[PDB]
Each structure stands twice: as structure tokens, then as C-alpha cells.
Amino acid sequence: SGFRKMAFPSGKVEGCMVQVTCGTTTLNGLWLDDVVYCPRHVICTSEDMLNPNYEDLLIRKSNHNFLVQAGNVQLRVIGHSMQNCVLKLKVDTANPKTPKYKFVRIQPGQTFSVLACYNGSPSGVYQCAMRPNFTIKGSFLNGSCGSVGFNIDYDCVSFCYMHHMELPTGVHAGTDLEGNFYGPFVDRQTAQAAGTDTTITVNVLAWLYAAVINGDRWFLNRFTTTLNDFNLVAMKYNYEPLTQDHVDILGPLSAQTGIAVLDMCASLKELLQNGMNGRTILGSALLEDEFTPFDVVRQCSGVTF
Amino acid sequence: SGFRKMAFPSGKVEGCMVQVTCGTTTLNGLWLDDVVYCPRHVICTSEDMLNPNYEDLLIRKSNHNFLVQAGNVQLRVIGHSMQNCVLKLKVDTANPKTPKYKFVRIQPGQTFSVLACYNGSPSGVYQCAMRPNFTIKGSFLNGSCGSVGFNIDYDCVSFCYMHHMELPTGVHAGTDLEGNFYGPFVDRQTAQAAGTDTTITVNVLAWLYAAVINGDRWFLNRFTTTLNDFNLVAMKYNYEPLTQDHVDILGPLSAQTGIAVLDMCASLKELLQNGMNGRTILGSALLEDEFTPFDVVRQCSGVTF
Numbered sequence: 001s002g003f004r005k006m007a008f009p010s011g012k013v014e015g016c017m018v019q020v021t022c023g024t025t026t027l028n029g030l031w032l033d034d035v036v037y038c039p040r041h042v043i044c045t046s047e048d049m050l051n052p053n054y055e056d057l058l059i060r061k062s063n064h065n066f067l068v069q070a071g072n073v074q075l076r077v078i079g080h081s082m083q084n085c086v087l088k089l090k091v092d093t094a095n096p097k098t099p100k101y102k103f104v105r106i107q108p109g110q111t112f113s114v115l116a117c118y119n120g121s122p123s124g125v126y127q128c129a130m131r132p133n134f135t136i137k138g139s140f141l142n143g144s145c146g147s148v149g150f151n152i153d154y155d156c157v158s159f160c161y162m163h164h165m166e167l168p169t170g171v172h173a174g175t176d177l178e179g180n181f182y183g184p185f186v187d188r189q190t191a192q193a194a195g196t197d198t199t200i201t202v203n204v205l206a207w208l209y210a211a212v213i214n215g216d217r218w219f220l221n222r223f224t225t226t227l228n229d230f231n232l233v234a235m236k237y238n239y240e241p242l243t244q245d246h247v248d249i250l251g252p253l254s255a256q257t258g259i260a261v262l263d264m265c266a267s268l269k270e271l272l273q274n275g276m277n278g279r280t281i282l283g284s285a286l287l288e289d290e291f292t293p294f295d296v297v298r299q300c301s302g303v304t305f
Numbered sequence: 306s307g308f309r310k311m312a313f314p315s316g317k318v319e320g321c322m323v324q325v326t327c328g329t330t331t332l333n334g335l336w337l338d339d340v341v342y343c344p345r346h347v348i349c350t351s352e353d354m355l356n357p358n359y360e361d362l363l364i365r366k367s368n369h370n371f372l373v374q375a376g377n378v379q380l381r382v383i384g385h386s387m388q389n390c391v392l393k394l395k396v397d398t399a400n401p402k403t404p405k406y407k408f409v410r411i412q413p414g415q416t417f418s419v420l421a422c423y424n425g426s427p428s429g430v431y432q433c434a435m436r437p438n439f440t441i442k443g444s445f446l447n448g449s450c451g452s453v454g455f456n457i458d459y460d461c462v463s464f465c466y467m468h469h470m471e472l473p474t475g476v477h478a479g480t481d482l483e484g485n486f487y488g489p490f491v492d493r494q495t496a497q498a499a500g501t502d503t504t505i506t507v508n509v510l511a512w513l514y515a516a517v518i519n520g521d522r523w524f525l526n527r528f529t530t531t532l533n534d535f536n537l538v539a540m541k542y543n544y545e546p547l548t549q550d551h552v553d554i555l556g557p558l559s560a561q562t563g564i565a566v567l568d569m570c571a572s573l574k575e576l577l578q579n580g581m582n583g584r585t586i587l588g589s590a591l592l593e594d595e596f597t598p599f600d601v602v603r604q605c606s607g608v609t610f
């Protein structure tokens with residue numbers, strides 16, 4: 001029993017983190033096979049923050065301008081290329097610690113582990129969700145650019161996020177590992193801001209199922225609701241609409257607890273309308289939305305890697 | 306910016322996790338140099354749960370009764386010994402992945418990362434505190450015995466917890482790596498229960514400093530308090546007493562924010578007496594006590610390993 005914000009073990013990703021330096025700028029890179037992936041912002045200088053043309057900046061660089069360090073071992077760059085907002089540095093050494101991996105672009109509402117790094121050295125690991133507004137609520141200081149987010153499936157690392165920047169509200173924006181930003185953000189200094197966010201309804205429902213699995217039942221009631229009636233209330237409280245696909249995805253948890261999905265929706269409706277009146281759920285006085293249905297199953301049933 | 310419940314990168318510990326089987330019981334072990342450490346409960350059977358004499362149980366075993374698996378590689382046990390509630394299996398192979406490490410017995414209020422494992426395979430990582438009542442609020446399923454807790458300092462892993470059992474309230478009890486339980490618990494089936502717990506005051510104060518560092522200031526006020534006056538209020542709300550040692554430990558955060566420790570104590574007093582009136586701090590509607598002063602500094606200043 002118990003329920004924690006649980007990250008994936010980070011070792012397979014630790015072995016891939018490197019430092020990349022170009023000029024005065026140093027940040028983190030991801031070394032997989034003989035390629036290092038990092039934010040293209042590394043080639044920027046202090047005469048460029050305002051709309052730089054990265055194709056011009058890159059044409060003016062040569063391989064010897066890139067310093068890549070894996071631990072105390074310098075790696076020789078033998079080729080360089082740009083893909084969207086990521087740089088690909090070909091190096092002369094294949095990472096012997098390369099895990100089985102793939103690159104995936106995730107949907108809003110999905111969760112992943114972040115390995116926060118500084119100067120190529122991992123510092124900590126934590127769980128994030130991709131918010132509906134395509135930001136993440138991370139924990140990143142200066143030097144964290146190029147830190148990555150990932151899930152692990154069996155023995156395979158699915159990389160889904162590379163960190164680029166902090167927006168004015170303190171939340172974070174970045175790219176998939178092919179260099180495409182999540183959301184409308186761009187890697188240049190402009191007035192961009194996070195859009196209004198919404199709560200991830202299917203995740204709140206999953207977490208209520210987690211609570212039942214762990215013996216928290218005070219919020220249950222005898223009522224049911226219709227999808228349409230529930231979504232009318234969701235919209236009022238700035239919750240994402242709940243689809244039939246979400247209902248089907250919650251099927252396993254509904255079957256394990258014997259609580260129909262639309263019955264749990266009526267409990268959530270009551271929680272939204274009345275609050276918790278001083279009670280907690282799984283140690284939280286707020287409704288938690290950064291656990292997916294799969295996260296609950298994995299932690300309330302114990303799968304490993 | 307941002308503030309997350311952040312674990313240490315787990316890779317150095319992943320490389321030490323093994324499976325140990327004796328008879329019908331399988332759990333996790335920790336392989337360091339040529340020794341595997343695991344809960345002595347592994348030698349128990351279904352004719353023993355009620356006060357077993359472990360010295361008798363152990364004298365009746367031989368090395369070939371212990372099956373140790375590291376991945377798909379069986380390790381040959383060449384010696385076995387008991388130390389308090391842990392078994393030490395000498396194996397014929399030194400773990401080539403042994404990190405720099407030490408064993409430490411932590412005080413209540415200190416935090417650590419847990420690498421939850423099943424059958425020798427890591428499944429997830431999360432941050433725990435040792436509660437004042439010497440339980441932890443973990444997340445563990447059947448098969449998690451022998452999972453370990455740890456901190457990392459520079460390149461050194463300080464192992465501080467090995468998981469043994471779940472108590473009736475769903476919280477968790479275990480030992481240091483020398484096999485001594487935290488708290489009054491014993492590894493046998495009896496009516497033992499968690500004692501009444503208390504909130505870790507110095508950690509709440511650290512977290513309020515984290516919030517200020519991150520721009521949450523609504524809970525501040527112009528008042529100060531005396532240590533004695535503050536502790537009178539703490540006791541009322543079942544908070545641990547705050548000592549001068551705690552005040553000195555908060556010195557760095559007090560200096561970075563320019564908020565005297567006893568000034569923050571008066572803010573906490575007001576929060577205890579009046580609640581949050583619908584506001585949040587660092588995304589929480591409760592006062593968080595599982596971040597130490599050192600945890601705040603490391604995450605709000607970015608040290609790595």
C-alpha cells in the first residue's frame with residue numbers, strides 16, 4: 001500500500017548525459033549511439049538573443065567549435081546538423097551505455113520522468129505531466145537546458161522531452177527529441193506566455209481510483225451521472241472534457257474496484273461542488289491530476305523494468 | 306524555478322539490486338563488493354511467522370539453500386551470516402558496479418530516496434522522510450522487501466534504509482543496512498502499530514523558505530516570535546519542538562531570503578492558527594514537511610553528482 005509520485009529508475013538515462021559547450025554557452029546533451037542531441041540554443045551568443053537566424057549561426061560553425069564531455073572524457077565531434085530546434089552532433093565514439101530506446105511525441109495529460117542535469121551531471125529525478133497548455137511544471141535552474149524527460153517500457157527508454165526554457169510564470173517549455181516544441185513556443189526571446197491551463201480530468205479520476213485501491217472511500221456516493229451531465233460540470237470548473245476514450249481507458253481500474261466510471265464521475269462532481277471539508281485524499285488537500293490511469297495500475301500492481 | 310519532490314538519480318543503486326530466494330520466499334537484496342544484504346525474513350516459512358528463532362532457522366540452512374540472481378546471472382553463495390535483522394550472503398563474485406558507498410543510520414526528519422524493487426528489478430524511485438514515529442509513508446507492494454533507501458553525496462551512496470514490512474495503518478517499517486530497525490518494530494507477526502506521529506517543524510520552515518525563493522510570499526507577515534512562544538503553539542498543533550540547532554541549520558535559507566528564522570516562525574504560527582483560506586503554497590493546500598533544509602538548498606541552488 002501507499003501512493004507516491006514515482007519516477008522511473010533513471011540509470012539508463014544517466015549513462016547518456018553529456019556536457020556540450022559552444023563558445024561561452026554550456027548545457028546538457030543526450031548521447032545515443034554515435035550522436036549527441038542538444039538544444040540548438042547552444043550556438044547562440046549575447047549578440048543574438050533577439051530573432052537569431054539559426055541556419056546562419058550554424059553555417060558559421062565547425063566541428064571543433066563544439067566541445068562534448070562525457071565524464072572526464074572529451075568526445076570528438078565529426079559532424080553537425082540541425083533538426084527543428086535540436087542540434088545533432090555526430091561524435092567519433094558510440095555510447096557503450098546506449099539503452100534500447102525510441103523517441104516519442106506525447107499528448108497532453110501524459111506523464112514522464114525528468115532527469116534534471118547540470119553540466120552533463122544528473123542531479124535529481126521527478127515526475128511531470130505535459131499540461132493541456134503544453135507546458136510542464138518542472139524544477140529547473142540555469143544550466144538545465146537539454147535535460148530530458150522519458151518513460152520506460154520493459155527495457156526500452158521512450159524519450160519524450162528535452163528542456164529548453166522557462167516562461168514568465170515559472171513553468172517550462174521544451175521539445176520532443178526531434179526538436180519540435182510542445183505548444184506554440186519558439187526558442188527566441190519574445191513575449192510568449194503560457195496559455196490558460198485546465199485540469200486533466202481522466203487523471204483525477206485515475207487518482208480517485210488509486211485512493212479507493214488504497215482504502216480512501218469517504219468521497220464515494222451512491223449516485224451516477226451521464227457523460228454529458230458530467231462534462232457540463234467539468235467545463236464550469238475548468239476541467240478537460242471527458243471522452244468515451246477516457247472512459248474505456250479507465251476500464252481496468254473500474255473493474256478492479258467495482259466502481260463504474262460514471263459512478264466515480266458523480267463523486268468527482270460532488271467534490272468539485274462541495275470541496276473536501278477539511279478531509280484529504282492520498283495525503284492531498286487538492287485533486288491531483290498528474291497520475292495517468294497507467295501510472296495508477298503500475299504502482300498499485302507493481303510492474304518493474 | 307519550480308519545486309518538486311525530487312529523488313536522487315538511482316543508477317548507482319540499480320546496479321546493486323539482486324533477487325534472493327530461499328525455499329518458497331523471494332525478495333530483493335543489495336549486492337556490494339562480494340556481499341549481498343537482504344532481510345533475514347527470507348529464511349522464514351509458513352510454519353514460522355509467529356515468534357521464529359532466527360538463529361535456529363539459520364543454523365539449519367546451507368549456502369546452496371540461497372539462490373541469488375543478478376539479472377540472468379546466478380551468483381554462488383559461499384558464506385552466510387546474520388547481523389541483527391539482515392542476512393549477509395558472501396558470494397563468489399564482487400559486484401563490478403559497486404559504487405563508492407557507506408551505511409548510515411538516519412535521524413527522524415531526514416529524507417531519502419527509495420528505489421522500489423520487485424524480484425531484483427527496480428520499478429520506481431521516490432522521496433521519503435523518516436517520520437518522528439520511525440515509520441515511512443512509502444509505496445510498496447508484496448515482493449518489495451529488501452528495497453533500499455539512500456542519499457547521494459558527491460559520488461558516494463549513503464544507504465540508510467532497507468524495507469521489511471507494512472504496518473496496519475499502511476505505513477512502512479524497516480532497518481538500517483546493519484539490520485537495526487528504526488523504531489520499536491520487530492520482524493515477526495505481533496500487534497505492533499505505529500505510534501502517534503508529529504509534523505517535522507524544521508522541514509515545514511525549510512519549505513516555506515523554498516516558497517519564498519520561488520516567489521510565493523502571501524503568507525509572510527511583519528511579526529516575529531520567540532522560540533519559546535512558537536513552541537507553545539507547535540505543541541498545540543502536534544508539531545515537533547523547534548530547537549536552536551534547527552534555527553542554526555536554517556541559517557543559510559534565512560540569509561538567502563533575508564527573512565529571520567523567528568520571523569518565518571511567526572508566519573507559520575499564523576498559518577497554523579488561521580489556515581490557508583483557499584490559497585496554496587508551492588502547489589500544496591497543506592503544509593509540507595518532507596523537505597529538509599538541505600533538500601531546499603540543493604534544489605533551489607542546483608548541486609549535482
Ligand SMILES: *C(=O)c1cccc2c1CCN2
Nearest residue numbers: 039041145146164165187
Ligand atoms: C536552453 O536550451 C535554451 C533554449 C532556448 C532558449 C533559451 C535557453 C536558455 C535561455 N533561453
Ligand SMILES: *C(=O)c1cccc2c1CCN2
Nearest residue numbers: 344346450451469470492
Ligand atoms: C520482508 O522482508 C519482511 C520482513 C519482515 C517481516 C515480513 C516481511 C514480509 C512479510 N512480513
